[PDB]
Design a protein around this ligand. Sequence first.
Ligand code: CL
Ligand code: MG
Ligand code: MG
Ligand code: MG
Ligand code: MG
Lengths: 414, 419
Amino acid sequence: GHATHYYIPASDKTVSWGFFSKSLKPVVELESGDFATIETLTHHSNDDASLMVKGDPGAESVFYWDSKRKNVDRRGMGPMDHKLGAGGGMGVHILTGPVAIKGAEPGDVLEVRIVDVALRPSANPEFKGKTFGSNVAANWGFHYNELIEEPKKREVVTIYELDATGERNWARAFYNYRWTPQKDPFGVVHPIVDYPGVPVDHSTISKNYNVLKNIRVPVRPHFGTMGLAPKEADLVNSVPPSHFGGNIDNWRIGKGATMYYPVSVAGGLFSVGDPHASQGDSEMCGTAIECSLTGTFQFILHKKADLPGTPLADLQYPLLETQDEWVLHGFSYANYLAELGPDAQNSIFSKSSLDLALKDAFRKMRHFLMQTQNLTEDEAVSLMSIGVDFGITQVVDGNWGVHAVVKKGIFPGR
Amino acid sequence: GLTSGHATHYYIPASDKTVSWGFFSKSLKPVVELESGDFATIETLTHHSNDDASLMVKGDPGAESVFYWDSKRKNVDRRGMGPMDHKLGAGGGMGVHILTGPVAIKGAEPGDVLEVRIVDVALRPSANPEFKGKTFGSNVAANWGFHYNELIEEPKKREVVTIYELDATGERNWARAFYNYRWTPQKDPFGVVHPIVDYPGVPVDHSTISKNYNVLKNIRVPVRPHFGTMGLAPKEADLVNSVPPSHFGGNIDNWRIGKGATMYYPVSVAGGLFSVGDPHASQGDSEMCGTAIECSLTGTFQFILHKKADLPGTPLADLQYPLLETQDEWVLHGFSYANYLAELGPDAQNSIFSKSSLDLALKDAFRKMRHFLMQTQNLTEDEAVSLMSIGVDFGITQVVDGNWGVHAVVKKGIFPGRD
Ligand SMILES: [Cl-]
Ligand SMILES: [Mg+2]
Ligand SMILES: [Mg+2]
Ligand SMILES: [Mg+2]
Ligand SMILES: [Mg+2]
């Protein structure tokens, strides 16, 4: 007959901007086995509204901001009266959701199969068949303290053109510009990119169109931010990833990937956003090609009682599976909210470390190998030195990330 | 000319006459001097061969020459850059790798770049007649490994030797664990007891250890043969510990530095003074436990000299670090300190082991990729910064050699190339 398949469009009614929250009312509640097509929006759409907002009803509904109203006021987990704007930009990602999963209990694991991904086409009739994205070299980027050309303190927006049909499998830089102070419709001036979704006045910037000429950047569409609401606080900054998932910024989290997240609160409360058209391992400059995407997902609940003796045994972190690999996500702190105590959401940005992240990845790969692949500690330690590759996920989200990749094909299986 | 004739191709066998153990040195006399365009086939030996002498030394004349140690003498006494009278043994184990060389390159001057084409690699076959067609390697989970302070099973402080079996013919393209054992204190022929693996090449007495066979059962580990340590003697000091990689190359431990790879190193001493060793059968990105599958290899190489004056407008422009080229990629090597000898001063060879940082290694990789993009691919700083965020992948090379390593990988095919 009929499988259950929800459609969640991106609008001011279906997203939260810059935070996860266990207390948010779900947009929908589905059952294990059900599907959802979920539209997501890049929070960088107002870097060029003509290309990424205007004419797009969903984007317009989220980004609307004039002197007389702002459709989505809170952006981040901070005070409503924050001087930069409600939420303080303490968290910047537009998160479609939450999605509740019937019967999901703390200690369960949720499987999310990413079965398809499509670029959100531009509504601009001049660019039919194209989608645009934005890469911002930002004040929170790992490069920022290292620039050598004057002015050494600068932020730079680079707009990329993508083929929304997927016929062309590479991105083309369209133009770049240095960020100049932008006064928002409520009168707050932003001399750096300190608050998300501010409409840029294109009469106040100077565009350079000849950029990255004839360089063909491979497309790797993925969702930067995807996960389940954590228990430790009612409002959680969307920027740092953790045990619950979130803003992992692993380019591999896209079509054909299956993610597994530990459930920390009843109903699970899944959200997805921060769509990217492509990204490198490190996300050096602070962002990817930030670009709107629609995904189709299947949700499968795994009960705690059924985890032992499977790859999900005692799973406490975000685990990625493809047809041929497992990819494990280490962070500077495995659960930064718990491990850094009450002040975690402030202190994490002062405590970032790749060395800690690799230690964490070591622990997780040891666990995976010991608890799911029948290896002793000594076996796991040897194998991971010779047959696991560890890479840098991102160094720009406060809780930094290292991933560990192992091929399925080497193992005899259970 | 158009007349046929012989090219110059040296053969350097591994022996006590052709290796130095645990150090680079600009003062070492070259074993061979060759010219740009010339070849050498160079045998290398793993410094872990005495983890099982029956498999990796006995009956192998070259290995026997290097590893010989009786109550009265060692054929290769210095192992490391340290004092000849160090308590552990000559050299102090301050550096552990058996390095075949040095090879001098005629006309190489400080400021030049040496290209080294790795054109072929062969496993060094075991001489053990019971294992014809096989080569053995050793992976040691060691005291200097990133895991060592993190172990959860008792005894929590332990080192573990895992011996692997390889097909020397290359027909089978994967490695099989043979056995493992915990390191127990080993008394060397001079009577010095080594409770941890603190000095290289100690003959393990197999009556003092307990072997576990059939470990990692039915796991097929891919083979990725490479040279862990390869590079040029640096100018900054006279004896230099082989463990930390740097500007001159050395102990990079990038699994990609094998057959079909071309390396480029900045020359800092006249003659270049190239050596190669620390052969590996396979390794993962991080070299987590302290070592790879440490396994003897023979390579064939071509040496091509690039004069300082000819570097501009090429990928080698102002090259100051080890650069790897394959058919489809460039791979740049960042380290906690780009030139740790120059940057850390007189105590460098000690302090590097306390100053290790992946954060710093990534900052260095950032600088190096910025330089490559700006100086070789005609990109502005803003263009480079954007591109490396979206189209360069940064990985962890190793975290066990003091000067820790991050590599940046970019695909050649994305670029329009120089017009
Ligand atoms: Cl002829
Ligand atoms: Mg992100
Ligand atoms: Mg993003
Ligand atoms: Mg090495
Ligand atoms: Mg080695």
